[PDB]
From a paper:
pmcThe protein sequence design problem is to find, given a protein backbone structure of interest, an amino acid sequence that will fold to this structure. Here we describe a deep learning based protein sequence design method, ProteinMPNN, with outstanding performance in both in silico and experimental tests. We set out to develop a deep learning based protein sequence design method broadly applicable to design of monomers, cyclic oligomers, protein nanoparticles, and protein-protein interfaces.
We demonstrate the broad utility and high accuracy of ProteinMPNN using X-ray crystallography, cryoEM and functional studies by rescuing previously failed designs, made using Rosetta or AlphaFold, of protein monomers, cyclic homo-oligomers, tetrahedral nanoparticles, and target binding proteins. Incorporation of noise during training improves sequence recovery on protein structure models, and produces sequences which more robustly encode their structures as assessed using structure prediction algorithms. In contrast, sequences encoded by noised ProteinMPNN models are more accurately decoded into 3D coordinates by AlphaFold, likely because noised models focus more on overall topological features than fine local structural details (which are blurred during noising). In protein design calculations, the models trained with larger amounts of noise have the advantage of generating sequences which more strongly map to the target structures by prediction methods (this increases frequency of designs passing prediction based filters, and may correspondingly also increase the frequency of actual folding to the desired target structure). ProteinMPNN solves sequence design problems in a small fraction of the time (1.2 sec vs 258.8 sec on a single CPU for a 100 residue protein) required for physically based approaches such as Rosetta, which carry out large scale sidechain packing calculations, achieves much higher protein sequence recovery on native backbones (52.4% vs 32.9%), and most importantly, rescues previously failed designs made using Rosetta or AlphaFold for protein monomers, assemblies, and protein-protein interfaces. As illustrated in the accompanying paper (Wicky et al.), ProteinMPNN designs also have a much higher propensity to crystallize, greatly facilitating structure determination of designed proteins.
Residue numbers in the entry: 5 to 133
Write the structure that this text describes.
Amino acid sequence: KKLYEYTVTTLDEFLEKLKEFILNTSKDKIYKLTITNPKLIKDIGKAIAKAAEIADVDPKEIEEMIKAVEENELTKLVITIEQTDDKYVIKVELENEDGLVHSFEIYFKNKEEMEKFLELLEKLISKLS
């Protein structure tokens, strides 16, 4: 069981760490990526929400995640990418200056579906100018 944490300060860093996660050979692996640049928070949060829409995640969950991404005084996005036990999950936490955190999970049935989602996220982030 391995937990890695990174502070992500550019879009290229975000793409690099998704790659590192996929290529990590551990059976049980967790990467936690922290983003504090509000412009990058919105870029990446909107990309996750769009990827979730394409993946047919619960529409009300996506609507709530967009609400969090659009909220005033956003200060932190934390993305936890987890493969452990029988679970394949991405957790999204959006935090504001007042310390209020909204959290969301996106589950996958297997490893292949999770890596396909991560590749979708990379494609969406790559389109950004």
